[PDB]
Assembly symmetry: C3
Homo-oligomer: 99 residues x 3
């Protein structure tokens, strides 16, 4: 494990971690708490999987092939949909908690 | 600092566009997800239920995209009748199906409790 | 016997969730968390299969790919445990 040192995983991971702490402190019921923690962790999961795929693509080599770009782009799109899912989740659950 | 964000956005859009342009099944899937999201958005349910209905179909989309990413790596290598090519695609597909079955079931449970 | 024990795990979990006297939402969360663990494991296995398809010779990016995949699985597992602890604490509170 030497990937944890890279600035990008640092940023993404710290965002997720912060969100998990804040969710741990909030005055919400249990199901809401679980939803808030899960959406963000799913963003972490997806980013890790995406990076795994990027690592394989790069393992194959430097010469560009359309399917390499495609694999990376599809990975990114997955990450994007997860992020949007996290944002919808927090917005819907906390608009309710807006007081 | 936020150029990572713009770069990543652009890759992501290229990815959605590729998936959509290349397969009718992907387009029809995307329609089903958009319809589910809209329906979830207008339904008279509580907030958690709305989120479950949304997250389940979103998850379908996320896994469909990751699995397609993997298919593209396989096809990149050659797919020349290999044991692990087969295996890789088989595992990816199992994943997709699990997501879909879970979404369907989640919707049926939640809408049974609702109506 | 490394892929079956997981089906055992999920069947057990499902049995517990059914057995527990919880409402539909809670049940959906309990089973979903477990299900995500399976999906992520299957995708990790897919990556591993490709990595080995390329070559069994070591290469830093191969190790990197497997490490990232395994970390995904770990995060899903942690998320499952957090979900179960939370929902069950709530149910028994
Ligand atoms: C008070 C918080 C309100 C918002 C809660 C939901 C936030 C949802 C997701 C946060 C995860 C973002 C991780 C950072 C990220 O994706 O960075 C992009 C990369 O650096 C691009 O390479
Ligand atoms: C800028 C566009 C995107 C904004 C983020 C996504 C929007 C998602 C949810 C909006 C909040 C839900 C509606 C407001 C709300 O909760 O009203 C109170 C209850 O509905 C009353 O039962
Ligand atoms: C609140 C947002 C919910 C989003 C749910 C997931 C949607 C997933 C996939 C839809 C992708 C749409 C891409 C459309 C596309 O590529 O169009 C290209 C056209 O051919 C030219 O513009
Ligand atoms: C009255 C109940 C149903 C309400 C339906 C509301 C809208 C639902 C789905 C909209 C899907 C529209 C297409 C989105 C999309 O990806 O378009 C692709 C581009 O137009 C490129 O051709
Ligand atoms: C324009 C809807 C489709 C695109 C966005 C989908 C994700 C964002 C929001 C959907 C959930 C928020 C809608 C408003 C809402 O929840 O209202 C609740 C009402 O109190 C009862 O319906
Ligand atoms: C109760 C629905 C909630 C779950 C939605 C899961 C969506 C997953 C996959 C969509 C399946 C494909 C949509 C139908 C389709 O392709 O129709 C095409 C025509 O039948 C033939 O061209
Ligand atoms: C293949 C993915 C999905 C796997 C789960 C399939 C369905 C299994 C279990 C879900 C719950 C079914 C039983 C419902 C239940 O226990 O109801 C409670 C009773 O009414 C007693 O209160
Ligand atoms: C060494 C780690 C110890 C904790 C691991 C399991 C804890 C899981 C999630 C942390 C959530 C903390 C917020 C408070 C909390 O759980 O409240 C429960 C709700 O009040 C409903 O029971």
């Amino acid at each position: 494990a030497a990937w944890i040192n890279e600035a990008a995983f640092r940023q993404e991971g710290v965002a997720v971690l912060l969100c998990v702490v804040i969710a741990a402190w909030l005055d919400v019921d249990a199901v809401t708490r679980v939803l808030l923690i899960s959406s963000v962790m799913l963003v972490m999961i997806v980013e890790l999987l995406n990076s795994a795929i990027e690592a394989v693509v790069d393992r194959i080599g430097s010469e560009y092939h359309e399917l390499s770009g495609r694999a990376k782009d599809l990975g990114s799109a997955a990450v994007l949909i997860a992020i949007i899912d996290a944002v919808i989740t927090w917005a819907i659950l906390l608009w309710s908690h807006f007081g």
